Amino acid sequence: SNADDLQMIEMHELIQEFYYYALTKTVEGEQALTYLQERGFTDALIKERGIGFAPDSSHFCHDFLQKKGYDIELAYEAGLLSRNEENFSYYDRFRNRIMFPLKNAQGRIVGYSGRTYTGQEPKYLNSPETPIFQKRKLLYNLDKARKSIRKLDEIVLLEGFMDVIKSDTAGLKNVVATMGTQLSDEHITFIRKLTSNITLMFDGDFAGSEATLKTGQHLLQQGLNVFVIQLPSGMDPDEYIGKYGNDAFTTFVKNDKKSFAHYKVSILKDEIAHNDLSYERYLKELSHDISLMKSSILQQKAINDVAPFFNVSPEQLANEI
Ligand SMILES: Nc1nc2c(ncn2[C@@H]2O[C@H](COP(=O)(O)OP(=O)(O)O)[C@@H](OP(=O)(O)OP(=O)(O)O)[C@H]2O)c(=O)[nH]1
Ligand SMILES: [Mn+2]
Ligand SMILES: [Mn+2]
Residue with CA at minimum distance from ligand 1 atom 3: 123
Distances, alpha carbon 172 to alpha carbons 71, 157, 185, 260, in Å: 41, 11, 25, 21
Distances, alpha carbon 113 to alpha carbons 98, 137, 172, 294, 300, in Å: 8, 16, 22, 37, 43
Q: Are strands 155-158 and 197-200 parallel, antiparallel or unpaired?
A: parallel
| 48 assigned binding-site residue | no
Residues 210 and 215: their CA atoms lie apart, in Å, by 9
Residues 131 and 8: their CA atoms lie apart, in Å, by 9
| 185 assigned binding-site residue | no
Question: Which experimental method was this entry solved with?
Answer: X-ray
Residues 81 and 91: their CA atoms lie apart, in Å, by 5
Write out residues with Cβ below 6 Å of ligand 1.
Answer: 121-123, 160, 162, 203, 205, 207-208, 236, 238
How many alpha carbons lie under 13 Å from residue 70 in its C-beta half-sphere? 28
Sign of CA dihedral 239, 145, 126, 70: positive
Residue with CA at minimum distance from ligand 1 atom 9: 123
CA-atom Rg of the chain in angstroms: 23
Q: Which ligand is nearest to the CA of 158?
A: 1
Neighbours of 234 (CB within 10 A): 10
Domains (range + CATH), the chain: 1-134 (3.90.980.10), 135-259 (3.40.1360.10), 260-319 (1.20.50.20)
Across 189-227, b (16+ Cβ under 10 Å) vs e yields ebbeebbebbbbbbbbeeebbebbbebbbbbbeeebbbb
Is residue 83 within a helix (H) or strand (E), and if so which, with residue range? strand 81-83
Q: Tell me how far the alpha carbon of residue 36 is from its chain's centroid.
A: 19
- How far, in Å, is the centroid of ligand 2 from the Cα of 116? 18
